[PDB]
Amino acid sequence: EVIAEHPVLLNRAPTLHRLGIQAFEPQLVEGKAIQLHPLVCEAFNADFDGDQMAVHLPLSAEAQAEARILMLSSNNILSPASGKPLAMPRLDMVTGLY
Amino acid sequence: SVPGAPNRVSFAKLREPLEVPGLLDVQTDSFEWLVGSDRWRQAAIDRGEENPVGGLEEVLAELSPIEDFSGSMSLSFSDPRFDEVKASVDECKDKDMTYAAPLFVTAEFINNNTGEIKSQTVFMGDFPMMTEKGTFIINGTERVVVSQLVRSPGVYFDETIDKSTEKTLHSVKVIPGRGAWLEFDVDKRDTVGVRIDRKRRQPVTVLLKALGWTNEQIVERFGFSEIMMGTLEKDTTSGTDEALLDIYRKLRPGEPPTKESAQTLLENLFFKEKRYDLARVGRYKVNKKLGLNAGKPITSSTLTEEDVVATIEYLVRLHEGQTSMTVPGGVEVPVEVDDIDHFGNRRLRTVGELIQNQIRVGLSRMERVVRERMTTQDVEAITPQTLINIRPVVAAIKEFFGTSQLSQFMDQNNPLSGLTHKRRLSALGPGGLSRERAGLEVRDVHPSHYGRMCPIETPEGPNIGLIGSLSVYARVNPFGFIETPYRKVENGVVTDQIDYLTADEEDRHVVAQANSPTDENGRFTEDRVMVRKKGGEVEFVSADQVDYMDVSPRQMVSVATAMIPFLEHDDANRALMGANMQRQAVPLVRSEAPLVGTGMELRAAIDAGDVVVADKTGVIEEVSADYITVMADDGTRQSYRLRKFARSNHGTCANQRPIVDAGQRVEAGQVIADGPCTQNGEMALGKNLLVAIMPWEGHNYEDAIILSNRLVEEDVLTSIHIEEHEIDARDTKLGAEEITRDIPNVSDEVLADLDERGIVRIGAEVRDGDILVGKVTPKGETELTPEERLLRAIFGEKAREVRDTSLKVPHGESGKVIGIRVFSREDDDELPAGVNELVRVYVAQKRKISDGDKLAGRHGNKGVIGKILPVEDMPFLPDGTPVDIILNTHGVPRRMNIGQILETHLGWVAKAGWNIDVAAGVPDWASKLPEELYSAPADSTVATPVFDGAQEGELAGLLGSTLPNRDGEVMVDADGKSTLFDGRSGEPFPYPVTVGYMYILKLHHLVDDKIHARSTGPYSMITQQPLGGKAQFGGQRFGEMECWAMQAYGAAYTLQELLTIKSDDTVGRVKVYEAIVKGENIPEPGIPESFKVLLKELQSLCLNVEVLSSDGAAIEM
Amino acid sequence: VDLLGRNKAADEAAERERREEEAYAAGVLDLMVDREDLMDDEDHLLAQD
């Protein structure tokens, strides 16, 4: 009941560009490893071969609104450097569609 | 060769002329030399070396005789002897003792006045001793001393580019084993100068005159060079005395200009052997380079005027571009600069030499006290015992083994880890290279590494290149240079003669490749052969030009790199990653040898030492889980106690188990008990299991891995982990702490499993927060608040002055208690000062494979388990067998580690036997295969050496010769692919999928000890911020780049709360916690304490600072 | 020039500039991530090493 609709920031140092910190809606999973959406890997420069990730919890109402609106992952499809899409099919997803 | 060796058919096509030497010799030989054991003495005199002297003998002889300032008194040492060790290795480990033996040396005091001689035997202390495994035991912990790579005490010439004028500047420095430096250089203005003892520069002619050379002799000797004559002309010093005075005032500016000292210091600085020494290796290098004393025996290691003049001449010749030089009375030698990275210049300090140096320092400290108190005690009533103070030497030895950077806790993760730790070559350490000067230039693969240091194996940490692993065939020259063997080649026919060459001498010959084709007689069957020449360059030369050959293809690789099959096909980076990941495998509950491997895995298993080998042939009288009793043929009886569930240095279980039956006959050297991570006496770091190479619903996306639930149900990848918790009761300013079961303010639900002593009972299971050892500490003044006094009144709480500090299981840990070890000074046990009792508790748990755990193959392919699927969901072969692991196809090609596919195919061929038809003659692709591989049953292990193993054509041919399955149908076609069914949908997959058996292993990067969280906890007193690390329950870092990202988002409030509320802001932190717990909306922050104090200071400076609201409104608060 | 020489000439502004630039480089190196809290799959060489 508590965790519902409470966004959390995911980060992976170093943070070279602003998309290195992104807010997600958390859902409980068994085990101990965080589950990350594949489409954001390119944004985080992360591969599932041993990488770790840090999670931060917004507390105040303003912080939650900022994470829910400004930092939400679904709102950051396009890269800020050139405006081209960043969260798009990659690797396996291409081979299937090809 | 090994009596109990399992029959592993080999694909090797080349016969090895030399067997792999003992892999731990690099340690045992050095320690034998240090203690002067008879074995080393014989092995050395076998080399034609007369009267070898051990390290202790050498140091004692160099130390003595110690002569009194007046010459009326003297003291001498000799005859070092060792007695039996106080206790066995296992007992020392079990009782936190140090494995050491007494040291005795005969000491003679001599009085030259009355002629009295007083000879006795003096106890020099307990000298630590090396075990049969090449390790030491200190305070119950097992430690290893790694060899150190250091620049040899030679003479080194070099040329550099001037920063200002960009000219070429030539320089030389003489580096001694002990003493001050001497160096020369040609300045950018063509002025030859000399720096003595690193001090201010001055003309070389000053030094030449100071040695007694007149201007005429200098002109005659150095007349060939105009720069030297110009320097002499511009040298404003004449005569020997004036030059000596100048040098003396240069080295001793604050001392009177007496002539006697001016003459004496120069003689006592370089040329007299009391304070200067080249250590018999610097002398050899200097003689070889400068061509001095050619063919003479090494008589003394002191510097001489002749070689200094030779060095000056060498420098001058080098500056003017001459290539060859001949010295009067010497032999012609080429003139060239020196590459300090070349192993003709780098030498190896083994454990023996390091311990010898430490003993030398200790005895040097002892000598001062001895000679000082020679002048304070009455004469003729002074025995050696009265002035031999052995405290400094014992203190030095203890310091080296306790705090030195080279003595380290043995990497006991698994047998291979420990074996490869004992064979390290570390450039970093005292007397090596500076901490901040470890630039990218030194940490590189020089050509001279070939055959003596592996280029692939190196740690991933900050020591990449600074730490190396000795090659399998290499060994150490008694001077410390690393030798390697080569076969002699004459007239193009390979000879059985084997000679060991150093990197300095290898460059003088042409060395052919190991696997060059040859005939039965040994003659080369090719017109041109690939060879390495002087500069490390590989070229092609005629068959009549080769001088040597490599003994075997495996000469360059190390022990770990030798255990990667199909190493040809893996890139250098991935080979490095695989070699290092082999060192991180965690032992499993049941080990299993790989189906496809290398012949090294056997030897590496035995040389590691973790396997028990029968010493003498006999019959196994009795066998049990705990011990094995053997009756030798000669009537002697041996008993081997096996170590069960022992905790290694890194928390892994070191359980052994016997592999022999009562009444069985065992040959000498046969393996009778498996080690922690070996099967039948060969390395079993991982498990071989069925793999299908295909993407699967994206669960193996981006190097992730999918496992069948079978691996969880059958405990295939389960491992046992043991943690050691510790606590003690210490004396305090209010008194001594106490261990009790009556800890205050706890329900019986909490301490039910505690014994009478207050320690958790053995066998009880504990979870995070459970009490392990009940401990209480005295408290100070109480001064109860009115509320607290009321609570005492309403519960009848009688006064007590103790507080609970009982040991508890850390956050996120659990398991069953398997052992308790308790010490107490009341039982004469040694404890730290001000401590009464100490308790150690062992908690063991059985970790299964779970999501997030890291797995990897031997080829550098690694991933994390992203999903564990039910058995029915896995793709299954037509006969119904479900695959165990699924690896994504997209990770193989771009990583250039296709050797994993070779391993997969060959493992499939091994699992199901093969039979090559010979009805119509051997197939053309089977010509090179040895007959032993023409057939094999199911589960027949095979061997494929790193650089001489299964070929692509042979493997492709074998893939089509596999035997059928139970029903008689071949699952895998000739291409190595099979038609898999979909576990979920049930439809067959449209295309065949590569299937085979891969050997994968569980790395020590388990998620169980990487997950971390923190809402609130301890804080650092120095800076007020949250602590750091999982052990301290610290928080995550929020660097400046994260702040930049937050600013780029425009998330002002989140950044503000991160920097203030979640950081060093006590009032705001408490307010926010209170608001959250009480349900109140989070209070707003503002006005931190730092700004308040800054404003107060500004006011103190009479600066009327004030804060105003809006665009020009009134003040606020 | 040989007879007269130089009066041990030294520069002060250049030393200040050198000090400031070295301090800025030190700050740049400090700005990078430390080995204590890396998030990569395995330890590796850092610029500070």
Ligand SMILES: [Mg+2]
């Ligand atoms: Mg990674």
